[PDB]
Amino acid sequence: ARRIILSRLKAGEVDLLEEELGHLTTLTDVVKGADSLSAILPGDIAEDDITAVLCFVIEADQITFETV
Amino acid sequence: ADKELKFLVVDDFSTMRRIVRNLLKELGFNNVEEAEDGVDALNKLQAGGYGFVISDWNMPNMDGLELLKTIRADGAMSALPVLMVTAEAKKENIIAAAQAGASGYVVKPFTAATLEEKLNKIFEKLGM
Ligand SMILES: [Mn+2]
Numbered sequence A: 001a002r003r004i005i006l007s008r009l010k011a012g013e014v015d016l017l018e019e020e021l022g023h024l025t026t027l028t029d030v031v032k033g034a035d036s037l038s039a040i041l042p043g044d045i046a047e048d049d050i051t052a053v054l055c056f057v058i059e060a061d062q063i064t065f066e067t068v
Numbered sequence B: 001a002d003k004e005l006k007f008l009v010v011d012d013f014s015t016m017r018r019i020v021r022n023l024l025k026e027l028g029f030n031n032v033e034e035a036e037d038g039v040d041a042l043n044k045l046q047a048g049g050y051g052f053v054i055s056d057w058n059m060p061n062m063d064g065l066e067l068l069k070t071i072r073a074d075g076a077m078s079a080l081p082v083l084m085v086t087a088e089a090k091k092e093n094i095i096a097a098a099q100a101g102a103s104g105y106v107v108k109p110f111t112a113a114t115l116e117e118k119l120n121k122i123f124e125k126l127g128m
Helices: A013-024 A047-054 B014-026 B038-045 B064-073 B091-099 B112-126
Strands: A002-006 A028-032 A037-041 A063-067 B007-010 B032-035 B052-056 B082-086 B104-107
Touching: A002 A013, A002 A047, A013 A028, A013 A037, A013 A047, A013 B091, A047 A063, A047 B091, B007 B014, B007 B038, B014 B032, B014 B112, B032 B038, B038 B052, B038 B064, B052 B064, B064 B082, B064 B091, B082 B091, B082 B112, B091 B104, B104 B112
Parallel strands: B007 B032, B007 B052, B052 B082, B082 B104
Antiparallel strands: A002 A037, A002 A063, A028 A037
8 A cells, every 4th residue: 555745734734634635535544743644545546636636735845655 | 916816707606606706805806707607708718817717617518627628728828727616525526626727626605714715825826
């Protein structure tokens, strides 16, 4: 499976982006930090699709995908 | 953002159009024009001088996703901010909107405060 990491989030974005990700897939192993958010992705959505939706709110350099 | 930014509000229900116009008025934006579907929006956009498009999703003749794709493939207005209005957050539609170049999307019914946050986020991203 794959892991997504979101950094340099401003106030309210950690909750907001968990919710946005919620609409697109089911997240496991969620870790909500003060200004960061990481979670494991099922693999039922292309990552480019996640990035495009998440980019409605943040920048592309704040999103990282990696093999767990 | 320039308070006299010209808006094109698109929706097949005149009531929804009046609602959006009043909400924009509540935010200080009074230079607003209306359209009833995607075709009618492309026709008015021809007059030029538009700064923002707020568009409904489901409309007859030409829907919002097709209007968006058309604005984005047109060299003269390809960078025009387009905010998509939908009645439900649903994966297939959000992805479609993002991948087609939507500046953002908002779920109706929405408040003036939600509209302000949406507009401000787009203004920040585009440097307006
Ligand atoms: Mn409609």
